Amino acid sequence: MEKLWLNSADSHVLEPDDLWERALPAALRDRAPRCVRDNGRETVYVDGQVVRRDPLDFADAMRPPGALDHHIRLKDLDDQGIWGEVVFPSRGLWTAVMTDPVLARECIKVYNDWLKSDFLSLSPRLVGAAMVSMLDTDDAVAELRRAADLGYQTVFLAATPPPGREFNMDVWEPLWAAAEEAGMTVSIHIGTGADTVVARGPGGAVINYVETLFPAQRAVAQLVASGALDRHPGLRVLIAEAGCAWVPALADRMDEAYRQHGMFVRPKLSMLPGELVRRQVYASFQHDETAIGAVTAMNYTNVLWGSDYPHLEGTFPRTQEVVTELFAGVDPEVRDLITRRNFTDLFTVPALPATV
Amino acid sequence: MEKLWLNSADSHVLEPDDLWERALPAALRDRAPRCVRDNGRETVYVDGQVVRRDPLDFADAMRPPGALDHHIRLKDLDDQGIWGEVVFPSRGLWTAVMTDPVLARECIKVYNDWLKSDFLSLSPRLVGAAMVSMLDTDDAVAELRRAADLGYQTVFLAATPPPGREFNMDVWEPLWAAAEEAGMTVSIHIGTGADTVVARGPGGAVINYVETLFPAQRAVAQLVASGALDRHPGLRVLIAEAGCAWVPALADRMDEAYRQHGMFVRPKLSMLPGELVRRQVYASFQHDETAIGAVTAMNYTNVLWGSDYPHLEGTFPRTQEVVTELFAGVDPEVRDLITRRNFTDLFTVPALPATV
Ligand SMILES: CC(C)(COP(=O)(O)O)[C@@H](O)C(=O)NCCC(=O)NCCSC(=O)[C@]1(C)CCC[C@@]2(C)[C@@H]3[C@@H]4C[C@@H]5C[C@]3(C[C@]5(C)O4)[C@H](O)C[C@@H]21
Ligand SMILES: [Mn+2]
Ligand SMILES: [Mn+2]
Ligand SMILES: [Mn+2]
Numbered sequence: 001m002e003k004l005w006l007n008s009a010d011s012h013v014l015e016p017d018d019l020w021e022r023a024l025p026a027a028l029r030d031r032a033p034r035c036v037r038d039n040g041r042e043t044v045y046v047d048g049q050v051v052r053r054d055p056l057d058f059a060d061a062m063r064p065p066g067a068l069d070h071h072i073r074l075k076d077l078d079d080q081g082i083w084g085e086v087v088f089p090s091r092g093l094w095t096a097v098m099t100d101p102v103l104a105r106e107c108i109k110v111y112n113d114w115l116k117s118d119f120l121s122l123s124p125r126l127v128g129a130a131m132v133s134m135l136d137t138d139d140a141v142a143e144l145r146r147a148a149d150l151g152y153q154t155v156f157l158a159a160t161p162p163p164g165r166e167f168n169m170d171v172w173e174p175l176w177a178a179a180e181e182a183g184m185t186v187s188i189h190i191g192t193g194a195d196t197v198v199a200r201g202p203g204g205a206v207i208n209y210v211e212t213l214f215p216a217q218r219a220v221a222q223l224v225a226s227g228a229l230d231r232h233p234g235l236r237v238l239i240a241e242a243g244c245a246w247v248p249a250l251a252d253r254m255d256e257a258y259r260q261h262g263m264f265v266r267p268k269l270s271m272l273p274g275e276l277v278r279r280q281v282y283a284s285f286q287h288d289e290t291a292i293g294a295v296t297a298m299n300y301t302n303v304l305w306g307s308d309y310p311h312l313e314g315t316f317p318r319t320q321e322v323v324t325e326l327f328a329g330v331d332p333e334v335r336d337l338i339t340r341r342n343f344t345d346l347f348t349v350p351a352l353p354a355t356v
Numbered sequence: 357m358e359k360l361w362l363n364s365a366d367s368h369v370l371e372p373d374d375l376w377e378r379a380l381p382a383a384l385r386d387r388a389p390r391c392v393r394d395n396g397r398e399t400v401y402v403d404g405q406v407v408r409r410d411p412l413d414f415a416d417a418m419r420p421p422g423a424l425d426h427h428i429r430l431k432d433l434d435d436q437g438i439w440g441e442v443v444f445p446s447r448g449l450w451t452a453v454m455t456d457p458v459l460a461r462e463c464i465k466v467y468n469d470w471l472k473s474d475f476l477s478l479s480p481r482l483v484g485a486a487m488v489s490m491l492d493t494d495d496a497v498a499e500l501r502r503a504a505d506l507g508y509q510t511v512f513l514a515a516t517p518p519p520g521r522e523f524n525m526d527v528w529e530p531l532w533a534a535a536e537e538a539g540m541t542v543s544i545h546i547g548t549g550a551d552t553v554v555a556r557g558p559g560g561a562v563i564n565y566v567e568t569l570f571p572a573q574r575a576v577a578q579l580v581a582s583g584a585l586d587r588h589p590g591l592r593v594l595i596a597e598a599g600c601a602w603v604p605a606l607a608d609r610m611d612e613a614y615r616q617h618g619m620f621v622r623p624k625l626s627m628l629p630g631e632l633v634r635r636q637v638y639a640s641f642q643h644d645e646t647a648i649g650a651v652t653a654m655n656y657t658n659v660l661w662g663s664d665y666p667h668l669e670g671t672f673p674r675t676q677e678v679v680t681e682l683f684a685g686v687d688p689e690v691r692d693l694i695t696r697r698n699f700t701d702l703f704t705v706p707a708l709p710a711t712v
């Protein structure tokens with residue numbers, strides 16, 4: 001009966017089961033990501049490897065219908081009061097754990113074409129993330145430039161890059177130049193790329209959810225400390241689904257090492273790590289009240305709200321109730337920044353009509 | 357009050373070069389930490405392994421005369437306007453990378469004996485951290501109890517425990533119980549238990565200072581998610597030298613897993629992860645402005661200042677210039693909580709007339 005319009009910096013689409021089977025040549029078509037949900041488990045096959053074997057809860061973790069039917073998804077946007085929404089891959093994310101650059105490149109093209117033709121075509125409120133090869137810089141630059149020509153506003157990078165392709169390495173430089181030139185936002189989504197750590201013991205569910213942060217913090221440390229962002233002032237990076245309050249914490253950690261350990265520090269930066277973070281690093285959250293304190297108390301203005309539809313850790317179907325609780329008693333300019341404006345700085349959707 | 361009088365939750369004592377040479381059984385003597393100073397490098401040997409190599413400029417920058425001479429240390433405390441100070445090991449920290457429980461147990465006993473008898477005895481302004489075995493719970497419990505009887509107020513644990521001895525494991529339960537029974541604070545100091553040189557490419561120095569956070573965040577997640585803090589309401593944990601504003605960020609991350617991933621969460625907790633963190637998890641910093649933000653906007657009141665005397669990361673010798681600028685225009689109550697009062701909740705030193 002009373003809702004506030006929001007924009008969302010994070011959600012996922014479920015690709016068609018046969019997306020890659022139907023579109024790839026026979027040398028490639030059997031090796032592309034395949035999800036099986038059977039007998040209370042999700043199994044993912046990539047290029048002859050079991051990359052996931054996760055329990056499901058057939059009772060208490062049932063997927064929203066709109067995950068399975070894109071017309072129910074658009075009703076859910078209106079019901080939740082979300083206008084614009086960034087859309088990341090689901091099965092497509094598994095291209096980041098591929099070792100074959102050819103399988104990666106061709107699976108990425110297929111995904112970027114399907115997403116635009118068949119999904120983004122449903123509404124210009126949908127802002128797609130184009131995948132680019134995590135394995136090969138020439139392949140990555142080619143696909144970013146092709147995606148830019150198709151109208152994509154952001155590329156997805158996995159939080160854990162392949163071995164020897166850390167984000168501080170020179171191998172990425174041409175992608176940073178190409179992203180800056182095209183004005184593409186680089187969106188680094190957590191929980192993607194090779195597994196780094198899996199908790200097995202007591203508290204595993206909570207520990208595993210924390211462990212997915214460390215690749216995101218490391219990626220920010222790598223981009224800032226390496227001068228990648230310093231050399232590319234127009235390059236903006238969105239850390240998707242990692243929360244926000246650690247970002248000013250990391251700025252202060254990097255400034256302390258930069259100033260106190262300066263005799264070990266190479267390269268030199270034109271400005272402090274914390275200044276590059278506050279200028280170019282954005283982060284999304286779903287429920288975290290601390291994201292608001294980062295803005296009001298830590299001069300970190302690059303916070304974006306995200307629904308993370310249709311994941312358990314997102315807000316659905318209580319988006320409006322969550323955002324009411326979050327912003328009870330908060331300056332409406334801060335609500336406007338976090339829920340609408342940062343989104344429209346990074347992304348272009350059609351004009352949100354006014355309500356009076 | 358020409359000075360702002362502070363308590364320091366973090367500093368280090370450099371052990372006598374011959375501490376272990378003289379005190380250990382003959383069979384163990386050669387295996388204890390020892391160093392060679394040649395070319396312009398200090399090399400540290402532990403039990404048949406090179407654990408650390410440093411240029412002498414960096415090695416000796418951490419060794420102003422107060423780092424060695426405890427009489428000069430007390431003068432430097434007065435000069436810096438610091439009253440109470442927690443003192444952590446330097447060479448003793450290498451017990452956390454030993455693989456032999458007997459060698460670790462005996463080296464720890466030698467350290468704890470020297471520290472109380474020859475260092476802590478000069479002033480009640482000094483609060484020592486007793487080491488306890490990282491390798492064997494019975495050894496760790498016996499030494500915590502012995503150290504308590506000697507009047508120790510805190511024990512040091514390494515941030516990266518040995519493989520299979522993660523902090524969520526049942527093996528630690530007897531130690532949590534002994535620490536709670538004795539009123540002993542558990543102090544986890546970052547950059548211990550593991551090699552700190554992880555990154556070697558561009559931005560390496562800044563990246564490595566960030567990587568030391570990941571074991572600290574993992575440790576808090578393990579202690580919260582396992583129920584170790586929930587089962588021991590009297591147990592307080594100090595995370596030393598990791599900064600502060602990531603702690604409330606982690607509180608929110610764990611609350612989101614707890615609530616949205618509840619069907620996968622074991623054990624259940626008597627209160628939310630964020631309530632355990634705000635009740636029992638303390639954290640120190642030297643320079644970080646975001647630490648004040650965590651208190652004023654994220655309801656995280658467990659923030660302690662530390663000089664980290666005499667490390668480069670710390671404020672020495674500009675302690676008054678740093679804390680004056682940090683707390684310029686800050687609520688005196690908040691300045692008092694962070695610089696004085698959390699210190700005296702954890703640790704007992706003679707009370708200043710806060711008359712001033
Ligand atoms: C520049 C590189 C990347 C080398 O690159 P290249 O191979 O030349 O490409 C590398 O040398 C570097 O990162 N240098 C900065 C100095 C440093 O080692 N940073 C580690 C992270 S900071 C750290 O680990 C603290 C927590 C803070 C500084 C003091 C620290 C190293 C102390 C020092 C040294 C040693 C280790 C120790 C206890 C000890 C007895 O005093 C703690 O375990 C840990 C601690
Ligand atoms: Mn997401
Ligand atoms: Mn998600
Ligand atoms: Mn949910």
Ligand SMILES: [Mn+2]
Nearest residue numbers: 372373374377
């Ligand atoms: Mn000698």
Ligand SMILES: [Mn+2]
Nearest residue numbers: 366367597664
């Ligand atoms: Mn320290």
Ligand SMILES: [Mn+2]
Nearest residue numbers: 597664667669
């Ligand atoms: Mn230090």
Ligand SMILES: [Mn+2]
Nearest residue numbers: 260668669670
């Ligand atoms: Mn310093």
